[PDB]
Amino acid sequence: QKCKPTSPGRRFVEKVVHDHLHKGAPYAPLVEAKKRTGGRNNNGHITTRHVGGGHKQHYRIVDFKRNKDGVPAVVERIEYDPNRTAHIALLKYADGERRYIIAPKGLRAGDKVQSGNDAPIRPGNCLPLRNMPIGSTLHNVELKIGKGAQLARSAGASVQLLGRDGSYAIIRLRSGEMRKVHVECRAVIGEVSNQENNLRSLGKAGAARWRGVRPTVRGMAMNPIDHPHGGGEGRNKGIQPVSPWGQKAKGYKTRTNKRTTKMIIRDRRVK
RNA sequence: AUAGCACUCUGCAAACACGAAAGUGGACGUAUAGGGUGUGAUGCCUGCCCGGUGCUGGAAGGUUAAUUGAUGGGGUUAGCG
């Protein structure tokens, strides 16, 4: 959707339109308060730069574990969620309990979902990787038994199931990494909704300020006391790029963990 | 500074940051996400060079630390003179 250039700040605005989303208030029992941080920790110092401001938001309690095995549920509606890029679906169980889940692509009001070993192979059903059919597209992949989904949760995300060896399943992630998972962990059929999410163009600086991003100052624009890039008469770089704390920014690898290196077989390539 | 563009790092107990540690932010987020760097709507575009410094990947050839202690040479005295 294009906006007409009636003002200079509207010339380059792109929006994604979805007419099936619910327009009313969210489901009250599943909503709680959430505060802004400003990127400051309990010492009160800034630990993440460029964070502050933005619109007030409530947190929606999303069920990532899907431990209500055996009971079918029906989708009531699809909702916008300010905490994430994907849409959410309100579920209605056969015994009156209501929960939120991440909405798979194509799920509409009136569809049926469930979880467990005996669930059918339909988008939105939650089954163990040992029971998943080989070659399927999955999302919401769990890493620790019972902890819940952690991988491939954003809009348009999906992973590919490739094979099953020993007690481990082989998956390919959307970053290009190829990895092992325990076969007992769960996953969900399908790929995540709102796949047009990356087509939007903000159009102006205020749009970023609404989402809570403060401006970025280049290190080249500072003094020597503030940044290794600071200083000089006129414009000049004269240095191999580094972070404000001296760490190289172009190609230098930073992974350190040695505990989980066995679970990665084929790295995405240029890690 | 900016919307837009590009490179690069990060598979989640994430990279990164604060702190002596416990711990906290990143985020009650999960590669369409998060950090760093440069450029700066849009239109047409963005040539040659990897010798130097850096980064990434190999090699098991040469050099090299703590550790180990084979050999060789001294000091001393039983005794022989």
Burial of A149 (0-12, 13-18, 19+ CB in 10 A): buried
Strand B–CB A137 distance below 7 A = no
CA dihedral A197, A199, A205, A211 (to 10 degrees): 0
Strand B–CB A198 distance below 7 A = yes
Q: Let me know: does A103 contact A88? Beta carbons within 8 Å.
A: yes
Show contacts of A8-15: CB within 8 Å, 24+ apart. Answer: A9/A203, A9/A204, A9/A206, A10/A203, A11/A203, A12/A201, A12/A203, A12/A204, A13/A201, A13/A202, A13/A203, A13/A204, A13/A207, A14/A199, A14/A200, A14/A201, A14/A203, A15/A200
Beta bridge partners of A32: A59
Nucleotide with the nearest C1' to A38 CA: B25
**Cα separations in angstroms, A154 against A103, A189, A233, A239:** 10, 15, 45, 37
Task: Take residue A103 and report the two structure tokens written for it.
Answer: 């909405």
Resolution (Å) of this entry:
2.3
How many Å does it take to go from CA A47 to C1' B19?
11
* List of E strands, A122-236: 126-128, 137-139, 141-142, 149-151, 159-165, 168-172, 178-182, 186-189
How many Å does it take to go from CA A269 to C1' B76?
71
* List of E strands, A49-165: 59-60, 73-79, 88-93, 98-102, 112-113, 126-128, 137-139, 141-142, 149-151, 159-165
Strand B–CB A160 distance below 7 A = no
Nearest amino-acid residue to B30, taking CA and C1': A151
Nucleotide with the nearest C1' to A42 CA: B24
